[PDB]
């Protein structure tokens, strides 16, 4: 009786691997080239040639493949979302880092809602957001040799706002980010050089 | 069609065996008188029909020149020769099927086909090596070693071609494929001997003193005696019960084996007299007809050589069956095969103390068929004028007869 | 040049020119009559005419 | 008759097995079937490229979904450079110093654009100077003044 | 019985060579000066002089020739479409790259 095993869809094992990688390496690391525990094999064999229309397609709807490799076992091999031809949103780790950073900044900003909308507030709002993004650059989530290559923050009258905006009660903050991408294809180019 | 990694020549013969015995070897003997002095000539020509299989020979050359571990991909087993001048053929579809399974292996770095020069056409030979260079381009981690189709000028069916310019025509790819191969010329002569069996070599002996029929008569007259063949025939006509019963079967089985051994030595005498009397073809037909009628009860008519094999395996089965069941010792000896096998020599001999009511009898036709042969080969002795003692004999059977002649044939 | 499945790939780039191979300069041809013109000298057939 | 075997207008070379007095039977020829190619005419050059490319390719699969930034490019360059320094010291690469024997380039503004990073591409460029055999040895004799 | 061979029209061997060259060198490379596998010879001999009206013609309808060369074997020698006098569309590789 105990020789028969259960076959499951893979979505709950993927959720455990999302939490394992985020604790080990951070949320900006792609959850691919990793192994799955309690798994003997995939149910279907997927070769090299039939994963090509899974990863890259004309609709842009990418499907990530679970595969086996000799000497390595069963691995997750694919880290794309269903907007797989988008230059901003094709990687899972980029989208989930934007989900973290936007919610953390939004919760810290509700202490400023009915504050005076003047130059004293705009200096402290800019420095709160800049101190947070400097820690993300030092941990490796933002690419750059220096901090002004990695991000920018702008807020103020004559920069993001008009005088008509002040009378209506609006304050505009603009934030731009440079998030690290994975290395999906590695191309080695060999050539002869003269003696 | 499974690739396997071996390490030495002893690993190969464990799983795959050795070479095929050659079928194209002939031995000639001639006795002559030169002004009163004897002269003996032994002639063994080199065979014009060889076996097309070369894999065991090539692995001997590989390990002798410094090779290490390698992979073996079988494509099938050997086929038999139809006769002494038709060796088997090599198929293109088997060798290309072997190339498809080696594409899935990671570790080998070199591709070889040791049987490929014996392919039927040269176009099949070049097309096989074009497929290996396309695999070396795709996997981009291997290299191919090539030969020519022949070492001399060969016939294509329409024209005669030289080996070097014919290889330059057959391989018709660009540089991105040609950089993965290398070609060598000419062939090499080795120190190895051909694989053969001494049970299949037949001697033809021409002598000035013909005693082929007389020596065949002396053996067959001696076996036709009361102590020799008549003594075989009159003999035939709980845990303590099984052990006593096995002693009775072992005495009957020992009597059958010396009758089968007597059948073997008779056939070697008549075959040397059939081959010696090429003159007067009507006499050869009579000697051949007398031999198959004697061989009826042994093979064709009754199962004499077949019951001696099944009784031996039934004898082993009853000695292991005593561990658990007495019904096992009852199901065999009464219901199944053991009660049925005894009936073919004597069907209802149990009617009295002596063997009577002889409904079925595979014996007592021996001496009737034997003295027919003695008279039939008696007509062959005035018609043979040139054949000596060892004409028509196997090479393995002359080693007790003449040991010095047998050792001389082995050197040639 | 197009890659869709993830992994490592190997490319070779051609830089060096090939080299020229020199031909023979003095190989003559003689055209005229002979005594027999045979491929096999024992068999009497002029198949090299 | 080995001259049209070794060098030919098609470039398809055939290696000859020959006998020499005092030396026995030898292999005399080491070319591939692309015998007029300045990159690929020798057997030993082609088989060294087959070894070096496969060893580097297997060592590189641990980097597939890694961050494609300056921290990765420093460690990828040093892994390949340490391997080729051992090949130079064993005699497979010709040069008086290591920068005469090879080079390795990888990085943004060297092998890659910013559009390449968004697509997920990392480009590594490797150039080699492999030792060739001495096939023809030409001795030139002359008189000098006393 | 096995000494008799099959003769085929050449269009299915050309399709295999189209896929081999596009994988090796790209779709902008002309599929000519290349070899064919499993082929012993062409069925008809075409010389240098009779390929001239095959390649260039007043109608513009070009036919590509399969030929043999000494030292090289059987090759494809021609890479034109049936609009062979068009300055935009006479080559196979230009048309298939636009597709």
Author numbering:
A (entry chain 4A): 496 to 690
B (entry chain 3A): 51 to 287, 321 to 495
C (entry chain 4B): 2 to 50
D (entry chain 3A): 545 to 690
E (entry chain 5B): 496 to 594
Published text:
Their conserved modules include an inner tube, a contractile sheath and a baseplate complex. For firing of the extended apparatus, the baseplate undergoes a conformational change and triggers sheath contraction, which in turn causes the inner tube to be expelled and injected into a target.
Typical CIS-like particles were found in both extended and contracted states. To explore the mechanism of AlgoCIS firing, we determined post-firing structures of both sheath and baseplate. Given the conformational changes that were observed in the baseplate components, we speculate that AlgoCIS might employ a similar signal transmission mechanism as the T4 phage: the large outward tilting of tail fibres causes the rotation and outward motion of baseplate components; the signal is subsequently transferred to the Alg11/12 core bundles and contributes to the tilts of the core bundle and the bound proteins; the conformational changes of Alg9 further trigger sheath contraction.
